[PDB]
RNA sequence: UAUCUGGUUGAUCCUGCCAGUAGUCAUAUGCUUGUCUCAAAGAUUAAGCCAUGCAUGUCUAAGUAUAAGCAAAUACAGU
RNA sequence: CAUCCAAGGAAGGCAGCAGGCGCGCAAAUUACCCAAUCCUAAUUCAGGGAGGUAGUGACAAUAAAUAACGAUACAGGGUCUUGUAAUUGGAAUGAGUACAAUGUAAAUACCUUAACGAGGAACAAUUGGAGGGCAAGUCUGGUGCCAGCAGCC
């Protein structure tokens, strides 16, 4: 064609530096690709949980940034609230129960920003840490920090020295660069004005990441709760029967199909399957809704809907492309046709205000009802319904003080689920067998086997010790963290067990050997094995006595000392424990405090036995 | 009070680290004893 | 007076916990253990 | 004053390449990051697109004062 | 390209200072002031995101803390010279905290200083590597395999 010489530059040096630093800027933007699976046309409220210490202040946050976006103070807030930001948006805010771990889990997996607060004077706690941890292992969400109670240092080097420090430690737990907010006072119950301001500017324009977990499983926050049985039911028969009861909420995630009986799963209360299901009318629609409803044909105040309280070139660009175009045929194929049967075959896509009911709910879900509590509702893929054994991998959390032990109890959250269980730790003979760990390896991983619902591989769990706030003291909480490897129902695990024995009459090459066995058939029935003595001799057994009960006579290559002791190896299968205990955490009067199965320490120091 | 502080473990963050000396802070006190060695050797070589 | 689903479950698993921490207080079996 | 050593050979020599050690107004990244002084910061890929706020106004004794403006020389007289 | 609405019409240009988007993988404050340097006007007086001040990822660069002196017992060179020690004795001091004063447009900070502040100096230094090259291991244990010897060491 031409010559390669005439399409040359004048500076190569300049095209070597720009062209290799361009060359990794470009590769920085690459990625693993996944689906979105989110609406284009009304896309569901981002969720906002505030998470904190108990004292330091996130119901001021929250009606600070209510307030500014809406010009209306509001008081008592409890439980999620929505509101409308920018012609688009909305954001249901969600205030997190500080002491208690169980909702702060569910939390973590359900929330899509986290504005994580922390005592500016006092420092980072345990209880941040906890739900970074949290966070991490079950799919980050975008972590936005706020930093309060900054009035209460006397001098500026104190304070620009100790929002270094803290903006270096959220730098560490948190990617590096990310940008936190300085809280300065609480003058009128609120905090000043500008801080208010970036914080609702910073997220009014934030865009989000599409997380594996929340784009296969449906999921759904609730919003209002309400009980719907007879008075006359209640009366005649005793007011104990369980309930027949409709919860309102938003879905989010994936369309849960509108046929009646899916399985669900509720975090902290069990598994149902869902009676009815419909799709309300929304209550807090954006203002663009409300245009294009006007033109169909062709809410000054009501912001707030608080009901719970009282008022190509690259592979990365073609495997994107192509999960797009399949998409829109999927969106295309959708539009052109009827939307009773779009209903029907698709079942609620996200962003639908949507009411369902259950049958056969317990007492505890609804007396002992709190506003204060969150709850979540998640759809179940067959593969979750399923029982059996798990084989996983886990360590030690490296900020755990204590390691954990065989066949104690953990209460672990994997996937929507939050259960006790009783795992059993093992590793490796070298890629031969199963070698049965009675204790946990202190800095590196093993295998682990337990009793519980089956689930996708490679999904992270996360364990934990007790949950009862009463007995935390200073120690850290998280305890094992970790991916499924496998799903099955029974494995091979092998404990080494060694019989011991003496002898009583030493013949030359022979002995006769007693105390391990106590009937003929015992000793007929390991015939063949090998004895090996204490000292190191070796031999195998040959005959059983009869006249004696456990008298035995056997073999050995030399002649055996009276003091010698035999001992005879074999391989003891064990097995797992098939407890499988829910955690019933928002079932109780209190939710502050729940004890299954006490460790084996507990338990001992409890009974005073060594 | 009631409100759980950090940890030291969980707060400088240092993991899996070898546990050095204390002379290792200080460049100055490890070069000393470094040439008082040496000159240790050079005076039992030097008789 | 009467006895709700949920105390049932509750009683239940409580006595599950019991019989299970009865057995794990209690001296290991002899074939769960070393040198027996 | 001017940092090279091997392989490519059983040795002797070109030629390119590879492995290694060291220096970097070189790009990127990681770990760590107590004090003093100092001073660089959206060019590298897109002179791509911009919410909101500010960035150019100005009066002397000395151009025009009936402000139903403010306080105290019947032509005005201060501000 | 793109904003507003009553649908008739109106309005737009951050390669100024902040700040945001441009990937779902990221990086300075939408801060204070004309006190300094100068610029503008009718003009000593007003204005100036020009500019200065402070804040912010170790760009680059300078100087520099994290210890110093002993007594006792062993190991020495062997009567005068050193090391080791869950041994011991008092001195000296700033990283921080802080009345004050200086500093500054007002501050922060620096320089100065009444007082507090050190034995595990816990007031808790890091990053790599070890036959070579151009330095520092003829150190230790464990793991996969062997139709090699013995046979479960
Ligand atoms: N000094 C100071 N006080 C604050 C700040 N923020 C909040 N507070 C005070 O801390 C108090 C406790 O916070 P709460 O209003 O009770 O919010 P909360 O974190 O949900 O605490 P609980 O309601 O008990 O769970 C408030 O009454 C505020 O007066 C702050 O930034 N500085
Ligand atoms: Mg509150």
């Not at chain 1, 938003?250 to 069990?270: N, Q």
């Not at chain 1, 391990?516 to 090998?530: H, I, K, L, P």
């Not at chain 1, 204490?534 to 009960?549: F, N, Q, T």
């Amino acid at each position: 064609g031409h010559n390669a010489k005439a399409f040359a530059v004048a500076a190569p040096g300049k095209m070597a530096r720009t062209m290799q630093r361009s060359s990794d800027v470009n590769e920085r933007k690459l990625h693993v690709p996944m689906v979105d699976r989110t609406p284009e046309d009304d896309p569901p409220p981002f969720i906002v949980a505030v998470v904190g210490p108990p004292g330091t202040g996130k119901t001021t946050l929250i009606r600070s940034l209510v307030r500014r976006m809406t010009k209306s103070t509001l008081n008592d807030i409890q439980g999620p609230i929505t509101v409308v930001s920018g012609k688009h948006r909305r954001l249901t805010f969600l205030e997190c129960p500080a002491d208690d771990l169980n909702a702060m889990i569910d939390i973590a997996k359900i929330a899509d920003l986290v504005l994580l607060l922390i005592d500016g004077n006092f420092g980072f706690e345990m209880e941040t840490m906890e739900f970074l941890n949290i966070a991490q292992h079950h799919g980050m969400p975008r972590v936005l920090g706020v930093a309060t109670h900054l009035d209460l240092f006397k001098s500026q080097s104190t304070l620009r020295a100790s929002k270094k420090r803290l903006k270096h430690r959220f730098w560490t737990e948190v990617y590096q660069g990310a940008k936190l907010f300085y809280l300065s006072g609480v003058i009128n119950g609120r905090y000043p004005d500008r801080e208010i301001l970036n914080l609702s500017r910073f997220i009014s324009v934030m865009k989000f990441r599409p997380l594996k977990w929340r784009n296969e499983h449906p999921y759904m926050l609730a919003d209002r709760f309400t009980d719907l049985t007879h008075p006359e039911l209640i009366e005649t028969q005793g007011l104990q029967i369980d309930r027949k009861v409709a919860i309102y909420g938003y879905l989010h995630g994936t369309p849960l199909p509108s046929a009646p009986g899916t399985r669900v799963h509720i975090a902290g209360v069990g598994d149902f399957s869902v009676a009815q299901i419909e799709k309300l009318p929304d209550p807090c629609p954006t203002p663009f809704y409300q245009q294009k409803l006007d033109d169909f044909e062709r809410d000054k105040d009501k912001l707030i809907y608080a009901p719970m309280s009282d008022v190509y070139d690259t592979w990365y660009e073609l495997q994107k492309a192509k999960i797009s175009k399949q998409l829109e045929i999927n969106n295309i194929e959708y539009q052109e046709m009827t939307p009773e049967q779009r209903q029907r075959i698709e079942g609620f896509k996200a962003g639908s205000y949507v009411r369902i009911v259950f049958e056969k709910v317990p007492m505890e879900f609804v007396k002992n009802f709190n506003p204060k509590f969150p709850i979540v509702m998640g759809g179940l893929l067959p593969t979750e319904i399923k029982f059996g054994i798990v084989k996983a991998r886990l360590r030690r959390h490296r900020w755990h003080k204590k390691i954990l032990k065989t066949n104690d109890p953990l209460v672990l959250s994997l996937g929507w689920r939050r259960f006790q269980t009783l795992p059993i730790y093992t590793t490796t003979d070298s890629r031969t067998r199963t070698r049965m760990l009675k204790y946990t390896p202190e800095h590196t991983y093993c295998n682990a086997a337990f009793y519980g619902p089956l689930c996708s591989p490679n999904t992270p769990f996360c364990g934990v010790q007790i949950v009862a706030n009463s007995d935390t003291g200073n120690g850290f909480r998280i305890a094992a963290t970790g991916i499924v490897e496998e799903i099955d129902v029974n494995i091979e695990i092998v404990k080494k067990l060694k019989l011991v024995g003496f002898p009583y009459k030493i013949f030359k090459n022979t002995a006769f050997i007693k105390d391990m066995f106590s009937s003929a058939m015992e000793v007929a029935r390991f015939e063949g094995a090998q004895i090996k003595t204490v000292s190191g001799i070796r031999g195998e057994i040959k005959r059983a006595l009869s006249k004696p009960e456990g008298h035995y006579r056997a073999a050995f290559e030399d002649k055996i000392l009276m003091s010698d002791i035999v001992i005879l190896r074999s391989w003891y299968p064990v097995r797992v424990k098939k407890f499988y205990n829910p955690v019933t955490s928002l079932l109780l009067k209190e939710k502050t405090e729940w004890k299954g199965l006490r460790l084996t320490g507990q338990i001992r120091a409890a009974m005073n036995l060594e | 009070d009631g409100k759980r502080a950090i940890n030291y473990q969980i707060l400088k963050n240092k993991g899996l680290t070898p546990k050095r000396n204390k002379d290792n802070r200080n460049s100055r006190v490890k070069k000393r004893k470094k040439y008082q060695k040496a000159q240790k050797k050079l005076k039992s070589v030097r008789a | 007076k009467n006895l709700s689903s949920f105390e049932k479950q509750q009683i239940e698993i409580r006595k599950q916990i019991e019989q299970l921490e009865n057995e794990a207080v209690a001296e290991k079996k002899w074939s769960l253990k070393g040198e027996v």
